[PDB]
Amino acid sequence: HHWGYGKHNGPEHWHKDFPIAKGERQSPVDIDTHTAKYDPSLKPLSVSYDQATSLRILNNGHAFNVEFDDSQDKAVLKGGPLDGTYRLIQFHFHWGSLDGQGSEHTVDKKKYAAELHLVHWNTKYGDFGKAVQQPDGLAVLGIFLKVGSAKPGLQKVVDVLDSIKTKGKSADFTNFDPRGLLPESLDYWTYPGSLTTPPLLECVTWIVLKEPISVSSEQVLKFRKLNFNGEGEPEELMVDNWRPAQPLKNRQIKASFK
Ligand SMILES: NS(=O)(=O)c1ccc(NC(=O)N2CC(=O)N3CCc4ccccc4[C@@H]3C2)cc1
Ligand SMILES: [Zn+2]
């Protein structure tokens, strides 16, 4: 009886196995744009993905992950609110059953159709597993998706999804350039939070871009053909794999922009 996104094992149940679910710095949150304050001290944000080396794409039963070779300093996030260098390890998405829902963060209570999470770990902790035990261990770059024009740089991901339909399937996925998933502007909001899935560790500096990317209805419809189940098990479509907004508690959301 494992955690998931069903009626019986969804986000409102997670606190029984993961009591930190009711903690002081849980994610995602609603971003109240009028209450976020411009912080002129944030340093410029630096996304350096030219040398990123993708390895594989995996259906883990909760989302699909594009994983990167993080054995050297190639693809790094620095600057913004961050002290030091954070290395890209994987990206994944959260999405809805309908275009009106799917994002984890919300903006003035608006839900986007999906949200991209580019996950990075702080190199001062040596490995990912050590980093997630630290309050500044991870930096996750979050990018909203809206439905409209296709995102050409997403299509290579869309086209491999038929080969990883069910939980536990993986496929080779080399030479994918995650710069093709970024919007034009790097304006962002930032706050201290958590993983949005169990174990819900409070180790993340969240950096949420203000500008959504546009993807086509056909691209997101292909996300919604994935399965939560394993092969040979009753089919359950992988949709609504998002945690709703959590209490902000004693936190301030900072804006990089006026
Ligand atoms: N929704 S979110 O952005 O808040 C979020 C939620 C969970 C994770 N975890 C992650 O990307 N994992 C978990 C992990 O232990 N390893 C173990 C080490 C290892 C090694 C290679 C590739 C991936 C991994 C994964 C990475 C991160 C972010
Ligand atoms: Zn995520």
Author numbering: 3 to 125, 127 to 261
The authors write:
CAs are a superfamily of ubiquitous zinc metalloenzymes, present in all kingdoms of life, and encoded by at least eight distinct, evolutionarily unrelated gene families (designated α, β, γ, δ, ζ, η, θ and ι) converging in the same crucial reaction, the reverse hydration of CO2 to H+ and HCO3−15–18. CAs were shown to be essential for the worms to establish a robust infection in experimental animals and findings strongly suggests that chemical inhibition of CA from S. mansoni (SmCA) debilitate the worms and curtail the infection. Here, we report on the development of SmCA inhibitors conjugated to the PZQ scaffold as a possible novel therapeutic target for schistosomiasis. All compounds were evaluated for their inhibition profiles on both humans and Schistosoma CAs, X-ray crystal data of SmCA and hCA II in adduct with some inhibitors were obtained allowing the understanding of the main structural factors responsible of activity.
The sulphonamide group showed all the classical connections mentioned above as the hydrogen bond with Thr199 and the hydrophobic interactions with residues of Leu198 and Val121. In addition, as for complex 35c/hCA II, we observed a water bridge among Thr200 and the nitrogen atom of sulphonamide group. On the other hand, for the inhibitor tail we observed interactions similar to the 34c/hCAII complex, such as the hydrogen bond with Gln92 (in both the alternative conformations introduced for the side chain) and a hydrophobic connection with Ile91. Removing the ethylene linker for compound 34a also did not change its arrangement in the catalytic pocket, proving that the key part of these derivatives is the pyrazino isoquinolinone scaffold that stabilise the complexes in a hydrophobic task, explaining, thus, their similar potency against the hCA II isoform.
